[PDB]
Design a protein around this ligand. Structure first.
Ligand SMILES: CCOc1cc(-c2ccccc2)nc2c(F)c(-c3nc([C@H]4C[C@@](C)(O)C4)n4ccnc(N)c34)ccc12
Length: 288
């Protein structure tokens, strides 16, 4: 039973320019919202709509999942700006990421690549956002280049998690990214910070291959068998040892033996850009 609040915005103030493509619950539009940002009368925003093929059960799921993001304030996690809970379509307005998803972006760099220092940068930003989320007791469950977003200034941020969330799970039992999923996720549907770290390893591999499909030539059923039986992605051609060392740490079959996101950041903080100190969660007062 969603209760409107602070975050509720008048539908009047919102303007939907053009389609950006399908996200978790429905179409995401580019647009403009009046007075959703302080010291900014009008703001360029992304607007996700729940389609009209949406059960009340799903329209409520949409708002509650969005509402999780109300508690989030992190430079490396895409920000919620406001909610339109009354009337249809139900809107969730958020920070517009003007260079789209990291997968598309990485695909665009293919024989027109990124330097080692530019890849470490992406890794640390993603790791920092994920460290922030795990600090706020949140497991993403769908970390992947396609759900990392790129800002105007090339900052990478943690994006859509909706895609994997069922309406019923927790209380009752009845969509899985097998190529990004840890063995314990594939075997038992266990999703923890440590499973998110596995996915993070796969995103490094995506970054180093400019978004090849992980385990290409294996079907989804084959990947499920292969990874559960200790299968691993081959080190990409001319992948820096720095990075492949990180992938190996993330792909420890046993979750206990995987590094935390903080440990990952510690291991690369030397090679991070100077700015990262001011914007990051890692260096923030909020970090433990
Ligand atoms: C950390 C959690 O972050 C999120 C949670 C959510 C979200 C999760 C559950 C319920 C409701 C919303 N939804 C997000 C989102 F829709 C976007 C988003 N998607 C796209 C489209 C889709 C495409 C076609 O792949 C590119 N965008 C284009 C431009 N700017 C965007 N911000 C953006 C980004 C981040 C999101």
């Amino acid at each position: 039973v969603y209760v409107p609040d602070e975050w509720e915005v008048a539908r009047e103030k919102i303007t939907m320019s053009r389609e950006l493509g399908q996200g978790s619950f429905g179409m995401v539009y580019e647009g403009v919202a009046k007075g959703v940002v302080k010291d900014e009368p009008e703001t360029r925003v992304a607007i996700k709509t729940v389609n009209e093929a949406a059960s009340m059960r799903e329209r409520i799921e949409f708002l509650n999942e969005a509402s999780v993001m109300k508690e989030f304030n992190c430079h490396h996690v895409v920000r919620l700006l406001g909610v339109v809970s009354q009337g249809q379509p139900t809107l969730v307005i958020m920070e517009l990421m003007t260079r789209g998803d990291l997968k598309s972006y990485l695909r665009s760099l293919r024989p027109e690549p990124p330097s080692l220092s530019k890849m470490i940068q992406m890794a640390g930003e993603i790791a920092d956002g994920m460290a922030y989320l795990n600090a706020n007791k949140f497991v993403h469950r769908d970390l992947a280049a396609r759900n990392c977003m790129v800002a105007e200034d090339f900052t990478v941020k943690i994006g859509d998690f909706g895609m994997t969330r069922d309406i019923y799970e927790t209380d009752y039992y009845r969509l899985l990214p097998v190529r990004w999923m840890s063995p314990e996720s594939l075997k038992d549907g266990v999703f923890t910070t440590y499973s998110d770290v596995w996915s993070f390893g796969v995103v490094l591999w995506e970054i180093a291959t400019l978004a090849e499909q992980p385990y290409q030539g294996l079907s989804n059923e084959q990947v499920l068998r292969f990874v559960m039986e200790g299968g691993l992605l081959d080190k990409p051609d001319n992948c820096p040892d720095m990075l492949f060392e990180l992938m190996r740490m993330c792909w420890q079959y046993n979750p206990k033996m995987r590094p935390s996101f903080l440990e990952i950041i510690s291991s690369i903080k030397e090679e991070m850009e100077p700015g990262f100190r001011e914007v990051s969660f890692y260096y923030s007062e909020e970090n433990k």
